[PDB]
């Protein structure tokens, strides 16, 4: 029953602050997720890996304005001082070896407009 529900798409005015939510399915509330950013017409880009305790490590080329935190089954991607380049769809994904076999679920993605 591994699913990831993401917060609704929203717009933010330059310089503002954004917090995105990716909720793990109850049974997998302690899972580590990955965040991906996809700007218009470009390939998805690895943003960060976020654990149950909110600790995380970001990808290369990721501004310190991007941080993550957790609250139970919730995984949050926080965007501080929103820039133009931040307009994109943010998708979270989670891997898992269920029946000795790989599995990877993505969320519906959340579109951030500036």
């Amino acid at each position: 029953q591994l699913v990831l529900t993401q917060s609704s798409s929203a717009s933010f005015s330059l310089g503002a602050s954004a917090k995105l939510t990716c909720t793990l399915s109850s049974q997998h509330s302690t899972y580590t997720i990955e965040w991906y950013q996809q700007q218009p017409l470009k390939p998805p880009k690895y943003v960060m890996e976020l654990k149950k305790d909110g600790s995380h490590s970001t990808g290369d080329g990721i501004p310190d304005r991007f941080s993550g935190s957790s609250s139970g089954a919730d995984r949050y991607l926080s965007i501080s001082n929103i820039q133009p380049e931040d307009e994109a769809i943010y998708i979270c994904g989670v891997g898992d070896t269920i029946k000795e076999q790989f599995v990877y679920v993505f969320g519906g993605g959340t579109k951030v407009t500036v």
Binding site: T32, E34, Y36, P43, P44, K45, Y46, E49, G59, I89, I91, G93, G95, Q101, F102, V103, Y104, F106, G108, G109
Partner: protein, 118 residues
């Protein structure tokens, strides 16, 4: 700097076959797991296949398990995805991704579009 380049997409028909390629450079190909991930027209991302460093292990979602085949030729630094019995549901942008440690898709290619029409 890591570079992944996909090729092989195009307009095809349901029932047919197609083979995609992904040219890699900027890193030691044989030392990493490679993957294929697709994005459907509705924007949904979907993991499609995984292959280990030397091609010894492969895994697929039950949605493509008996139809897609992921392979690699380390001497050519190339990743492949053999697609058979194409379905309309296979229409999407296909990306190759390289992992880094426990992170699955740390690096993505540019993507090649496979359009299945019916």
């Amino acid at each position: 700097q890591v570079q992944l380049q996909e090729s092989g997409g195009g307009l095809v028909q349901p029932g047919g076959s197609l083979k995609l390629s992904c040219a890699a450079s900027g890193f030691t190909f044989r030392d990493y797991y490679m993957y294929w991930v697709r994005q459907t027209p509705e924007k949904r991302l979907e993991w499609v296949a995984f292959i280990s460093n030397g091609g010894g292990s492969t895994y697929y979602p039950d949605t493509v398990k008996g139809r897609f085949t992921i392979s690699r030729d380390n001497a050519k630094n190339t990743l492949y995805l053999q697609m058979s019995r194409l379905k309309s549901e296979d229409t999407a942008m296909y990306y190759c991704a390289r992992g880094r440690g426990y992170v699955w898709f740390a690096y993505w290619g540019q993507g090649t579009t496979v359009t299945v029409s019916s």
